[PDB]
Amino acid sequence: MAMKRKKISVIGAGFTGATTAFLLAQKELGDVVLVDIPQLENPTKGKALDMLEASPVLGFDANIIGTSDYADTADSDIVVITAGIARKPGMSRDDLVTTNQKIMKQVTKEVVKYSPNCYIIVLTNPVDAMTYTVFKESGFPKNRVIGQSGVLDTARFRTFVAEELNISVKDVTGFVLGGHGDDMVPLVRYSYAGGIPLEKLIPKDRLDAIVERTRKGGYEIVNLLGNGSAYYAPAASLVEMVEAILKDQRRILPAIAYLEGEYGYEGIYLGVPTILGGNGIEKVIELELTEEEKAALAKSVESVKNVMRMLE
Amino acid sequence: HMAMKRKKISVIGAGFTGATTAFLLAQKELGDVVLVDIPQLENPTKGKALDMLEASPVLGFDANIIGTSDYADTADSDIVVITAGIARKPGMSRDDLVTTNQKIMKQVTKEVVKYSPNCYIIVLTNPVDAMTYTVFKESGFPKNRVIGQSGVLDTARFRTFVAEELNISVKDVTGFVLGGHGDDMVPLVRYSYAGGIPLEKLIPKDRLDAIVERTRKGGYEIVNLLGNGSAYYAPAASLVEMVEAILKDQRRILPAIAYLEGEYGYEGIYLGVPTILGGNGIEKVIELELTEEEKAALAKSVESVKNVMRMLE
Amino acid sequence: MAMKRKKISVIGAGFTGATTAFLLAQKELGDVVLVDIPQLENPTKGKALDMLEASPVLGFDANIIGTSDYADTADSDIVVITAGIARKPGMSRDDLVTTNQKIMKQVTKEVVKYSPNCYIIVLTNPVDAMTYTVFKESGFPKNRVIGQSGVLDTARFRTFVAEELNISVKDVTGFVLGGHGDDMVPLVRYSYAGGIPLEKLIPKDRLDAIVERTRKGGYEIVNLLGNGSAYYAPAASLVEMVEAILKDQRRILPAIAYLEGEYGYEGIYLGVPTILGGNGIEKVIELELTEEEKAALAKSVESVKNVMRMLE
Amino acid sequence: HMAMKRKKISVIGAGFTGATTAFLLAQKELGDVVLVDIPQLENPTKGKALDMLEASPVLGFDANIIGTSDYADTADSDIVVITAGIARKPGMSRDDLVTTNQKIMKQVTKEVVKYSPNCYIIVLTNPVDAMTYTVFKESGFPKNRVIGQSGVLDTARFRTFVAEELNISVKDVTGFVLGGHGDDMVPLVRYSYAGGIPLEKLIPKDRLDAIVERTRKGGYEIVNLLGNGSAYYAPAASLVEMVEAILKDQRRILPAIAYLEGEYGYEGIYLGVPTILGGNGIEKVIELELTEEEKAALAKSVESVKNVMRMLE
Numbered sequence A, C: 001m002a003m004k005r006k007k008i009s010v011i012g013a014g015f016t017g018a019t020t021a022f023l024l025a026q027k028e029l030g031d032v033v034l035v036d037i038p039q040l041e042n043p044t045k046g047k048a049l050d051m052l053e054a055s056p057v058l059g060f061d062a063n064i065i066g067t068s069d070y071a072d073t074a075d076s077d078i079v080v081i082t083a084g085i086a087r088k089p090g091m092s093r094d095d096l097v098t099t100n101q102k103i104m105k106q107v108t109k110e111v112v113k114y115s116p117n118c119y120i121i122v123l124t125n126p127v128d129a130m131t132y133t134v135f136k137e138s139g140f141p142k143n144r145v146i147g148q149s150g151v152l153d154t155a156r157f158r159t160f161v162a163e164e165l166n167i168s169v170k171d172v173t174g175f176v177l178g179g180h181g182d183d184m185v186p187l188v189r190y191s192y193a194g195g196i197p198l199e200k201l202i203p204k205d206r207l208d209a210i211v212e213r214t215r216k217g218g219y220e221i222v223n224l225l226g227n228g229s230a231y232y233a234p235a236a237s238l239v240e241m242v243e244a245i246l247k248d249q250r251r252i253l254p255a256i257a258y259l260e261g262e263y264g265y266e267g268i269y270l271g272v273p274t275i276l277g278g279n280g281i282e283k284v285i286e287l288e289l290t291e292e293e294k295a296a297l298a299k300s301v302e303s304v305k306n307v308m309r310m311l312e
Numbered sequence B, D: 001h002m003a004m005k006r007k008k009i010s011v012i013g014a015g016f017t018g019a020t021t022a023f024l025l026a027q028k029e030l031g032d033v034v035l036v037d038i039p040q041l042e043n044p045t046k047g048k049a050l051d052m053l054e055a056s057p058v059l060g061f062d063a064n065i066i067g068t069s070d071y072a073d074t075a076d077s078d079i080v081v082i083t084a085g086i087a088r089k090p091g092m093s094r095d096d097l098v099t100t101n102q103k104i105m106k107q108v109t110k111e112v113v114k115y116s117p118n119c120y121i122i123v124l125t126n127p128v129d130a131m132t133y134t135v136f137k138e139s140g141f142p143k144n145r146v147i148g149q150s151g152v153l154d155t156a157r158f159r160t161f162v163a164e165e166l167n168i169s170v171k172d173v174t175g176f177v178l179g180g181h182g183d184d185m186v187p188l189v190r191y192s193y194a195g196g197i198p199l200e201k202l203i204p205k206d207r208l209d210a211i212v213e214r215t216r217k218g219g220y221e222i223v224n225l226l227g228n229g230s231a232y233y234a235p236a237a238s239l240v241e242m243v244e245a246i247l248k249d250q251r252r253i254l255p256a257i258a259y260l261e262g263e264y265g266y267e268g269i270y271l272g273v274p275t276i277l278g279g280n281g282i283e284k285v286i287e288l289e290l291t292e293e294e295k296a297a298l299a300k301s302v303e304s305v306k307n308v309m310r311m312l313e
């Protein structure tokens, strides 16, 4: 009968989790619980308390707590999972999978104990196999277990196109199927500057360079930082997705969704166009792809099946 | 004829406090942001700035952010926020900390005034009373143009503790802390309310004293939890409010570190005092009628500030 | 939808209603149903549609409809009542109270039929007697029936003081108890610029002229417009009250609340300091008033009862 | 030394569109506002202005808002928005509306360009194409400093209908409408998408044709519902996006009414075209590669506009 705040738990209090927590609180999307392992309890509480102390200056009404106790996550409307080791150049794709999978299983189990009705958004890489792992561990219907990937890649692409044409990023669009890197399947033909196909504004070679920079866009921020991974744009990418769900916006967003025949694939998570709203993933949109695009996506899907085969 | 131009804000020092501020500034479309650090940290600075910029299509702000070690990129900044400085390492004395940071302020200020002769400057670097003073003397600028941050942060921690104690919105809680930062700050409970109701009516004294002491220790509370470095979220927010007040000439009444020429009985010092902050920087130091108890607490604060100023070379 | 958007119905689609609806939508507080009499159905649909067609420009996700059918208000979380008649030429004070009483009872019956669990915020003058009418007709708990006057009166006070001192309205606080007009009790003692008592910044004579201009603030706007009363600041005042409830903010705000011993009064609605949150009025706050502040609030309360004796 | 100061926007015509525009600009703190109307309506204009100001403490915005019939109060405006027009009356001919509004545009611009010789001007007043033309010729400003609004509003109505058809956020629908503000406007479905997907892939042809038509009648639909008056919320919203684009030098791509000097094969007229809008007003007309079908729908639109320009005294 009372009007209660949405409750958002963010698991992993490293740069991306914290940046997320702070953005969610500022936008008054609800109360935030920043979670990490017992050994990291003091810094998690320090970050959460520091964020809460900005509330009177920035003028947002939101609780923020830090914790290592998953009992504090009880009755979360949304949980965002950012726990685990980041993508870096020259890393063993298998080692990544092995350590993070274990983390997704231990986290998912504690999340569903205390919030059995929550919607879950996964950042942890590799995001297809880790979102798959939260899906199967959780026992949730596919509309409640969502992965982030395509929004971040479309943000880097739009940024590079906006700088290339010297126009508002507000009026530039991109469009990606599949995951990060080699797995990325962009549709330049469905990318525009104020409604005009980029393919009529930018020579093919310069467009192919922006696409390739988008593929290595993560590695680009790693190379600059020297001793971490991107966090500003990943966190902003999670917040757009959390907002679409909490405010039932019915956004069309690229997301990592479970396929049961869409694009001709079943039993997998894949970056596809999505409607995102109050029921989480409300539709996977099936485009008419050209023979070439179909081919590039069959290629992304074999990489997906390859990483799922590294799962114990 | 003059085309409409974006405001320009340079943030000197691209660690916790400067990067957090820059992102907030960018999200609020207060203008374009130049994030500046030493040559040795040029690339991490470029990474933070580019990561922030790649957030812009998602969060929906129009703002340029670049990282640089070339101060020439700061040219014609309306506002410069100085977070450049060094933390006190175990085995470094008080005196060597003041001196090291002093020397950073002199070198930073020289470059800032060279490329933006008309900018306003806000200083965070600790020890912030002494370092804001160094920036003032080095800049050659009139006092209205050189402002330190500390009060807004300390009132924010105080308003957080009172909001939690009473279970009410932080929006409806008011504090006032003058003096220095850390141990030296002077929270004034007489000028502190919830919905305009004096706090001494709503919270027993023993609890209110613990809230005052907790405010005083607020910095160390966060240092003790993080196990590397100091607070940045609330510090950054406090700088953003002060930047807003100036760029949008809002004439806020808030505590700022202001150069005194007689106010409260003191001259030739930066001290945390009530301020009108607007399009011309510190427009007024407001002189309150203090009690003997407040005056005595303020004078202890001034002794400590003069102690740190004696360590300057 | 598991994450349902909040639903706000605004009864009365004139100046205050329409301006309240457009602010609510812009702030994404929920979906808005704008309601007027069957005769004004089409202008109501056209105001609603016009605001909705601004949603792509201003960037808000919100439905706005106009209707003369209360079934459209079903399961509203909040109902804002602005329904009211403009006092005709050659109509007594008695018949004005009596005409708006009949409108509040008819409106309330429709409101409870379709949203028996809603919070009601009343603006309709005379706002103490009309809030009282909605409470009694509704059978709701007292925390779920609320009136607006204090916030608007504190807003005018704050504007005048901010003009006098040449400072941000953000750093000026006021406190107005009682009713509107001669009935309203501004407490200059509880009034500050940046926490500084206004009696320290403004000579008695200027502070007195500002208290009188706060008393007359409605009249002032009426006399400038020539046809109609204020709507911008009224609407803004209702939005802050709507926001304190939907986001469970627990503001301390002057609101028209039902008294059961507070200030030594019982069985009336009166402007008092209030904690406003997710349960509506969480408590009425009792200040230590001077002998003198007590006399003015008694003068006010006598004026409120005067109007209540006019209720059929 | 110059202190920081607010941007300054004068709104001419304090009716439905002006007042609504004024209240958005202030809430968003885009600058101080001066609401201008005839002397007969000075007190109602001051009443709106004061009502708005009295909301500022509640909605928490720092802006001055004033009402005036004296153009001296508009001195040194960065942006001037012109909404002034005769109130349409039962039985007023088209001649008398256009002819009267032309006179108003010439009188209003004379005063505007006298007190703000360096301002950017956005024109709403109908018939908007011919009226923007009249402000341009009377101002003696370069074409980049005199901009009309019609396409933002008309693409907003299109996006609204497509969003309702598909049940998706308006944030993810794009459209593009060229030409005039009449039945003659050209909504381009080819350059219109939902999440960058072509609308022809998602909406059947009969439905899409009905949306295009509902876009052409958009203004009329609102007139017919209101009974007395035309739309003002979406119009005010459209002016605000165009003011923001200029004040914050955003370099948006939106449809605006621009002086053509060869673009699309037309010379010496104002027409709704794809614009880059920024700190120097209209920075460029973008020439789309239209189909013969589109060229012809635009050619008609141009014919409708030249017909109005014939009636100009």
Ligand SMILES: NC(=O)c1ccc[n+]([C@@H]2O[C@H](COP(=O)([O-])OP(=O)(O)OC[C@H]3O[C@@H](n4cnc5c(N)ncnc54)[C@H](O)[C@@H]3O)[C@@H](O)[C@H]2O)c1
Pocket (backbone or CB within 6 Å): A011, A012, A013, A014, A015, A016, A017, A035, A036, A037, A040, A082, A083, A084, A085, A086, A087, A103, A106, A107, A122, A123, A124, A125, A126, A127, A148, A149, A152, A229, A230, A231, A234
């Ligand atoms: N989807 C994308 O596009 C995208 C982009 C950025 C990075 N990422 C992923 O998101 C994260 C970004 O790095 P970050 O800033 O979050 O890293 P970080 O190391 O700074 O923080 C992650 C946290 O996970 C914690 N953690 C480890 N095991 C845990 C467990 N069992 N339970 C709870 N917490 C545990 C770590 O202790 C650490 O604090 C990584 O997981 C990376 O794989 C993906």
Ligand SMILES: NC(=O)c1ccc[n+]([C@@H]2O[C@H](COP(=O)([O-])OP(=O)(O)OC[C@H]3O[C@@H](n4cnc5c(N)ncnc54)[C@H](O)[C@@H]3O)[C@@H](O)[C@H]2O)c1
Pocket (backbone or CB within 6 Å): B012, B013, B014, B015, B016, B017, B018, B036, B037, B038, B041, B083, B084, B085, B086, B087, B104, B107, B108, B123, B124, B125, B126, B127, B128, B149, B150, B153, B181, B229, B230, B231, B232, B235
């Ligand atoms: N006033 C307050 O309320 C308050 C609160 C927060 C922190 N602080 C102070 O703010 C300062 C910064 O805090 P932080 O957490 O950001 O520290 P940090 O080490 O994370 O960031 C400081 C940055 O300054 C840079 N820097 C050093 N010398 C420089 C120079 N010559 N030119 C340019 N950049 C230079 C360093 O390279 C570093 O990246 C400290 O002095 C801290 O004590 C004061």
Ligand SMILES: NC(=O)c1ccc[n+]([C@@H]2O[C@H](COP(=O)([O-])OP(=O)(O)OC[C@H]3O[C@@H](n4cnc5c(N)ncnc54)[C@H](O)[C@@H]3O)[C@@H](O)[C@H]2O)c1
Pocket (backbone or CB within 6 Å): C011, C012, C013, C014, C015, C016, C017, C035, C036, C037, C040, C082, C083, C084, C085, C086, C103, C106, C107, C122, C123, C124, C125, C126, C127, C148, C149, C152, C228, C229, C230, C231, C234
């Ligand atoms: N409490 C305050 O601070 C405050 C301030 C301003 C306005 N008010 C009051 O607000 C009320 C409305 O103000 P306004 O300026 O919007 O007036 P208005 O005349 O523009 O609008 C009132 C609307 O109520 C409608 N209405 C009448 N009977 C109705 C019914 N049975 N069902 C539904 N709708 C019905 C009318 O048709 C009209 O559209 C008045 O009572 C006014 O005195 C009080």
Ligand SMILES: NC(=O)c1ccc[n+]([C@@H]2O[C@H](COP(=O)([O-])OP(=O)(O)OC[C@H]3O[C@@H](n4cnc5c(N)ncnc54)[C@H](O)[C@@H]3O)[C@@H](O)[C@H]2O)c1
Pocket (backbone or CB within 6 Å): D012, D013, D014, D015, D016, D017, D018, D036, D037, D038, D041, D083, D084, D085, D086, D087, D088, D104, D107, D108, D123, D124, D125, D126, D128, D149, D150, D153, D181, D229, D230, D231, D232, D235
């Ligand atoms: N271009 C578009 O997309 C678009 C959309 C909306 C409306 N319009 C046009 O906008 C104009 C304003 O519409 P509205 O709804 O605000 O009308 P309105 O009649 O409510 O307001 C117009 C105001 O202009 C004032 N005015 C008239 N002559 C003046 C003068 N010489 N100097 C100063 N003020 C003067 C009037 O007093 C009146 O208050 C009309 O011409 C309308 O047709 C065009």
